Every structure is written in structure tokens, then in C-alpha cells.
Amino acid sequence: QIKDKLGRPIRDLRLSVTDRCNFRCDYCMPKEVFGDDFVFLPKNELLTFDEMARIAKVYAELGVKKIRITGGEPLMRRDLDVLIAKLNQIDGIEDIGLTTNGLLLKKHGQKLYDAGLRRINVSLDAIDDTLFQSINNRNIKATTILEQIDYATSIGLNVKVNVVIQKGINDDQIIPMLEYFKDKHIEIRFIEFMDVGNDNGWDFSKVVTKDEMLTMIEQHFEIDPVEPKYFGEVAKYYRHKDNGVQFGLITSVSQSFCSTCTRARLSSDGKFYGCLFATVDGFNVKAFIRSGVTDEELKEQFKALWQIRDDRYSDERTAQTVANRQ
Amino acid sequence: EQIKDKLGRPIRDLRLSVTDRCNFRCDYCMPKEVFGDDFVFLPKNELLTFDEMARIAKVYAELGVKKIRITGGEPLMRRDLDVLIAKLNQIDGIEDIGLTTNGLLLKKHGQKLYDAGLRRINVSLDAIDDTLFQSINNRNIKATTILEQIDYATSIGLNVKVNVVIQKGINDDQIIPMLEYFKDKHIEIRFIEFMDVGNDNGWDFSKVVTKDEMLTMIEQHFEIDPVEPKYFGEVAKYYRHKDNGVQFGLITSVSQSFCSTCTRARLSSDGKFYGCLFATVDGFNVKAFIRSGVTDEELKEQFKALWQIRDDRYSDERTAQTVANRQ
Numbered sequence: 001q002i003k004d005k006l007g008r009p010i011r012d013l014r015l016s017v018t019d020r021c022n023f024r025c026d027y028c029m030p031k032e033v034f035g036d037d038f039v040f041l042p043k044n045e046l047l048t049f050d051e052m053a054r055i056a057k058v059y060a061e062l063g064v065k066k067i068r069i070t071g072g073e074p075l076m077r078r079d080l081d082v083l084i085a086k087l088n089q090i091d092g093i094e095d096i097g098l099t100t101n102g103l104l105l106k107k108h109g110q111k112l113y114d115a116g117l118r119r120i121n122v123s124l125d126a127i128d129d130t131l132f133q134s135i136n137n138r139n140i141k142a143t144t145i146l147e148q149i150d151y152a153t154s155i156g157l158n159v160k161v162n163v164v165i166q167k168g169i170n171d172d173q174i175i176p177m178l179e180y181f182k183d184k185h186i187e188i189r190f191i192e193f194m195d196v197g198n199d200n201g202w203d204f205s206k207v208v209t210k211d212e213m214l215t216m217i218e219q220h221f222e223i224d225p226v227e228p229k230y231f232g233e234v235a236k237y238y239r240h241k242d243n244g245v246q247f248g249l250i251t252s253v254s255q256s257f258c259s260t261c262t263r264a265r266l267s268s269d270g271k272f273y274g275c276l277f278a279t280v281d282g283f284n285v286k287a288f289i290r291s292g293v294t295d296e297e298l299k300e301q302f303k304a305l306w307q308i309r310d311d312r313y314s315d316e317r318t319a320q321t322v323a324n325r326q
Numbered sequence: 327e328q329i330k331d332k333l334g335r336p337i338r339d340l341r342l343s344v345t346d347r348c349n350f351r352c353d354y355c356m357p358k359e360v361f362g363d364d365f366v367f368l369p370k371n372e373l374l375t376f377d378e379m380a381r382i383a384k385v386y387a388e389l390g391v392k393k394i395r396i397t398g399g400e401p402l403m404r405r406d407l408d409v410l411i412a413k414l415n416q417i418d419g420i421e422d423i424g425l426t427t428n429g430l431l432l433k434k435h436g437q438k439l440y441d442a443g444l445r446r447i448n449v450s451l452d453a454i455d456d457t458l459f460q461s462i463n464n465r466n467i468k469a470t471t472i473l474e475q476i477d478y479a480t481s482i483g484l485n486v487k488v489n490v491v492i493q494k495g496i497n498d499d500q501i502i503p504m505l506e507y508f509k510d511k512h513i514e515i516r517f518i519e520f521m522d523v524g525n526d527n528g529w530d531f532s533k534v535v536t537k538d539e540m541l542t543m544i545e546q547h548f549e550i551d552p553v554e555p556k557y558f559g560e561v562a563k564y565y566r567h568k569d570n571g572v573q574f575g576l577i578t579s580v581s582q583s584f585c586s587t588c589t590r591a592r593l594s595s596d597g598k599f600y601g602c603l604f605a606t607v608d609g610f611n612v613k614a615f616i617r618s619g620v621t622d623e624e625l626k627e628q629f630k631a632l633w634q635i636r637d638d639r640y641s642d643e644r645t646a647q648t649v650a651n652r653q
């Protein structure tokens with residue numbers, strides 16, 4: 001079994017398929033920085049689907065059961081159905097997932113289910129049209145996205161929602177969001193907002209802890225804990241007593257998870273990272289695969305890359321706060 | 327004055343083992359099979375002297391240690407333990423000195439201990455039923471006796487907390503009469519997940535009552551408020567009886583390991599250094615190092631080097647393995 005320096009297997013491949021997006025959320029792609037000026041990667045510098053297939057295959061032979069398609073907005077990638085179809089004919093890969101803001105689901109959703117997509121996570125940082133429009137900067141109403149989700153549901157897709165909660169900004173949205181997806185039978189998850197200050201420590205200001213979210217919810221709903229599907233399961237799950245619908249609370253900052261992190265990522269221009277955090281550029285997979293290589297030689301470079309992985313960034317920020325508190 | 331190890335962690339706690347002897351033969355710790363009639367314990371001369379301990383603790387204080395815990399073995403078996411407490415009480419920088427004990431010997435030694443400056447003790451007590459407890463400790467000690475020792479301890483001015491290790495099938499039906507009994511005494515009881523490494527080799531969850539599991543028996547018999555934490559990445563998750571305001575704790579060692587915030591150094595009873603509770607190999611021989619003749623400053627350089635190369639994270643390795651084992 002292939003394992004990093006901390007003893008973790010490879011089980012997940014996060015696959016970035018584009019640097020582009022039809023939103024300008026300010027945590028993520030603020031307009032100052034990603035303006036009309038901006039030059040996103042030209043066509044021929046993204047990986048072809050057939051290179052993504054070769055990489056996903058070789059990864060499946062080293063452990064990866066699961067693939068997550070991101071960007072960017074992944075739906076901004078043209079002919080995404082083709083990738084989903086290619087990846088879904090690889091036999092070690094059990095589940096394929098796609099993280100979207102959802103806007104393009106009515107346009108491309110059917111061609112993607114046809115191709116083998118059964119499951120999507122829709123980000124949606126707010127349900128009130130005014131606040132959400134002021135988060136996304138592209139004049140798109142939370143209502144629009146609540147209708148793409150319902151069409152995704154209707155074509156047969158399994159939909160889950162990712163909400164990043166921020167104190168002053170995204171706080172008052174927890175309760176109307178729960179109550180909405182409760183009669184919609186969709187599984188919603190509220191994620192702690194992540195942020196690091198000057199002193200390498202955590203930024204607990206805008207962060208509303210799993211402790212604090214539940215104290216709020218348990219006042220407006222009757223709530224039951226659900227024992228973890230598997231062991232080392234990221235999100236914590238609870239259930240509503242009347243209709244047994246579930247919601248999740250991911251504890252990013254107040255409860256780090258680096259020890260069971262099994263996720264390898266490829267960025268939109270074909271670089272390897274062992275962590276959603278990275279100061280330096282990583283191995284240039286693209287320059288490697290285009291210099292001519294054998295599958296079973298691609299297999300050794302990824303394996304060499306994983307075995308030398310020792311990433312633990314949310315752990316380090318955790319170890320720095322204890323160091324700063326001193 | 328702040329020293330960090332390979333994984334970013336500062337040194338803060340020193341665990342001092344003062345003896346390899348115990349008056350109990352607990353099955354998960356010292357079973358009679360292994361520690362029987364013929365087990366040779368350490369000769370006197372091969373224990374650290376109280377002067378040696380006082381000197382180690384002084385130099386660790388300079389490296390940022392604030393907290394000493396005295397353990398064993400059963401520490402109350404080490405003769406003249408009050409001498410040690412007195413010397414440690416004289417070390418600047420050391421804020422908290424604690425004792426972990428089975429509590430059998432508190433009436434015997436407690437006053438002399440208090441006299442010398444001890445104020446805080448944790449008492450291990452795995453059951454409150456007498457028959458079950460005899461069969462846990464294997465030396466015919468009733469739980470009633472330990473409860474009498476606990477009450478004497480509080481009466482002379484010691485702060486008592488209680489530590490309970492829960493194995494499913496054994497003492498898991500002790501969770502509610504122990505919660506209740508100590509709620510009434512205004513005593514802080516903490517419940518610890520049983521640590522057992524299977525085959526294999528990730529955790530063995532057989533027995534093993536989780537946090538959730540444990541907190542579901544509790545929520546049915548008592549009416550509970552969760553407590554916000556003292557400090558970032560704090561040991562237990564605390565809770566509060568609404569009555570009343572008594573606290574209990576839930577130490578989640580297997581379901582959620584705390585290695586990334588682990589701040590403890592240990593000296594064993596044979597005077598070896600360990601960076602972790604677990605340990606497959608012999609530690610640096612600190613006792614032979616001191617007895618070779620070294621200055622304080624040479625002792626310091628060594629503790630410091632010993633801390634900077636530290637990368638122990640035993641429980642997180644097991645957790646990682648437990649993930650890897652599923653596949």
C-alpha cells in the first residue's frame with residue numbers, strides 16, 4: 001500500500017478542470033485581482049481529458065477510489081460530460097463527484113448525468129437573494145440557484161449543499177437554510193470558515209464554531225446525533241426527529257483533520273499538491289506527461305510524490321495557536 | 327525559553343514516574359500474569375534520586391515547562407514522596423504540580439503531601455461497585471475504600487478529580503452511578519476512552535465506548551449542558567449538570583486523538599526520556615547522563631536537543647492506520 005510520511009493512504013483525487021468562474025465570491029475570486037484584465041489559462045495549457053483519464057487510471061492503481069471535479073466552476077469547462085464518461089470507465093474508481101455553484105446545471109446537468117454523474121455538491125453561501133448577490137458579485141440570485149438544484153434533483157442527481165458560515169456576514173442564514181432543505185429532503189452542510197492571521201495562528205473572529213452552530217439550531221429544531229457512517233468521517237451529522245432528514249457540521253478550524261487526509265490534487269494547469277494549502281508550485285505533471293511517458297512510469301512518479309508527502313497545514317496552524325497562546 | 331519539536335509543539339508538561347511498583351494489578355496495566363511473584367522490580371540505586379528529579383525539573387522549567395505530574399507505578403508507594411513535592415514547590419516557573427494515584431494510600435501520606443505543597447490530585451477509580459472493582463484491581467480493594475480515601479483527601483484541602491477508564495462489557499454500566507455520586511460530592515469525574523491496538527494494527531473499537539455513545543447514556547439519565555473549552559485544543563470535552571453546576575469530562579483518545587497539541591515530556595522510573603506515552607524502544611538514558619557528571623547547562627542543551635527532534639504522534643499513527651486498514 002502506498003502511504004505518505006504520516007502513514008495516510010491515497011483515497012481521493014481532487015481534479016481541477018478550470019481556473020474560470022461565472023462568480024466573483026470575495027473569499028475566493030475577488031474582482032479586484034480577477035477583473036476583465038485577468039488572463040486565465042489558454043486552452044492548450046489545460047490538461048486534455050485523455051491526460052486526466054491517464055492520471056486518474058494510474059492513481060486508481062495506487063489507491064484512489066474517489067474523484068472530485070472542481071475548478072473554478074467545473075461547468076465552465078466545455079464537454080465536461082466527456083471527462084465524466086472517460087473517468088467512469090476506470091474500474092478502481094467507485095464514486096465521481098462534482099463541486100459546483102450550480103448556476104449552469106440546467107444547461108449541462110442532463111448531459112452529465114447521462115455520462116455517469118450521480119452526485120453533486122452545490123455551494124450556496126446564503127439563501128437570501130440580497131446577501132447572496134452581495135457575496136457572488138455577478139448579480140445572481142440565490143433563487144436562481146435554488147431552481148438549478150431542484151432541476152438537478154429532478155433529473156436524478158443526488159444533491160448536497162456546502163455553506164461556508166461567517167460571523168457578521170453569513171450567520172443569520174443557518175436557520176432559514178435548514179428549514180428550507182428539510183422539506184426538500186436535501187442534505188445541507190455548514191462549514192467553518194478558514195483564515196490565518198499574521199502570527200501563523202488561526203483567525204477565530206469570523207469563525208462560528210460547531211459548538212456555536214448547534215446551540216443555535218437546537219433552539220429552533222429537535223436534533224439527534226448520527227453515529228459516523230465510517231471512521232475518520234470529516235463532517236458531523238445530525239437528524240431531524242419528524243422527517244429524519246440530515247445536516248452536517250464540518251469542523252475545519254476548531255478540530256483539525258490532517259491525520260486522515262487522503263487527498264491528492266491536480267490544479268487546473270496540471271500541478272500536483274498534497275494539500276489544499278501550498279506556498280510553492282508543485283510537480284509539473286503536464287510537462288512530464290507531454291515529454292512522452294509510459295502509464296506504468298507515470299505510476300512511479302505519483303507514487304514517488306505521495307511517499308514523500310508530509311502535509312499537515314491545518315494541524316500546523318493548530319500547533320502554532322498552542323505555541324502562540326504559549 | 328520556548329522550544330518546539332519537529333511537529334511545531336512546545337514543551338509544557340513533565341510527567342515524572344517515581345516508581346515501577348504498584349499495590350494493584352490492573353488487567354490493562356499490570357496483570358498478575360506478567361507482574362507475578364517473581365517479577366524483579368528496579369533496585370533502589372537505579373531509581374532517580376529526589377535531588378536528580380529536582381534538578382531535571384529546574385532545567386525543564388527554563389525550557390518552558392509549567393506543569394509537573396507525578397505518577398508511577400503507584401507514586402504513593404515511593405517512600406518520602408513529600409520530600410520530592412517540597413523540592414518541586416521551590417522551582418520558579420513551575421505553576422502546577424499534580425499527583426495521579428489509585429488513592430489507596432491517601433490517609434497515610436496525604437497530610438504530609440499537603441504540608442509540602444501538593445494541592446491537586448487525580449484519583450483513578452474504574453468502578454464504584456465493590457465486586458466489579460475488586461475484579462478490576464485484582465488485589466481485593468473495595469471501591470468503598472477508595473471513596474473513603476477521596477473524602478479524607480478533600481477534608482484536608484486537596485482538590486480531587488477522578489479518572490475512569492471505560493471498557494465496554496466491563497464497567498460501562500458504572501457511568502451513571504459514578505456521574506451521580508460525584509455530582510453530589512461536587513467532584514469532577516472524567517471518562518477516558520480505552521486504548522487498545524488490534525492485530526493489524528489500528529485501534530480496537532470493541533470496548534471502546536465512543537464519545538457519542540457515552541454522551542447518549544448520560545443525556546438519558548442526567549440533564550446536561552456542554553461547557554465551552556478552557557483552552558484551544560484542550561484535553562477533555564467538559565459538560566455541566568444544570569442543578570447544581572458540577573462538571574464532568576469525556577476524554578476521547580481513540581475516536582479523536584490530540585497529538586497535534588501534545589505538549590508532554592516523560593521521564594520513566596528508570597530515568598529514561600520519552601516523548602510519548604507509547605514507546606517501542608528504550609529512551610535516552612538521562613540518569614546515566616546526569617551520573618556521568620554534567621553541568622545544568624549541559625543537561626539543558628540535551629533536553630532541548632531531545633525536544634527538538636521529537637516527532638511522536640502515536641495515537642494519530644493508529645488513527646491513520648485505522649483509516650488505511652478499511653481500504
Ligand SMILES: Nc1nc2c(ncn2[C@@H]2O[C@H](COP(=O)(O)OP(=O)(O)OP(=O)(O)O)[C@@H](O)[C@H]2O)c(=O)[nH]1
Nearest residue numbers: 395424426448487489518561577579588590603641
Ligand atoms: N494520549 C495521551 N493521553 C493522556 C496524556 N496525558 C494524560 N492522558 C490521559 O488522561 C488521563 C489522566 O491524566 P492525568 O495524568 O491524571 O493528568 P491530566 O488529566 O492529563 O492533567 P490535569 O489537567 O492536571 O488533570 C490518563 O489516564 C491518560 O490516558 C497524554 O499526554 N497523551
Ligand code: MET
Nearest residue numbers: 071072073099100101123
Ligand atoms: C474553489 S470552489 C470551486 C467549486 C464551485 N465553483 C463552488 O465553489 O461551489
Ligand code: MET
Nearest residue numbers: 398399400426427428450
Ligand atoms: C498508569 S497510572 C499510574 C498512576 C496510578 N497508579 C494509577 O493507577 O492512577
Ligand code: SF4
Nearest residue numbers: 021023025028029072
Ligand atoms: S463560485 Fe466557487 S470558484 Fe467561483 S469564486 Fe465563488 S467560490 Fe470561488
Ligand code: SF4
Nearest residue numbers: 258261275276313314
Ligand atoms: S491541511 Fe492539507 S493536509 Fe490537512 S486536511 Fe487540509 S488538506 Fe489535508
Ligand code: SF4
Nearest residue numbers: 348350352355356399
Ligand atoms: S493502579 Fe495504576 S499503575 Fe497500578 S496497575 Fe492499576 S493503573 Fe496501573
Ligand code: SF4
Nearest residue numbers: 585588602603640641
Ligand atoms: S499518543 Fe503520544 S503524542 Fe499523542 S498525545 Fe498521546 S502522548 Fe502525545
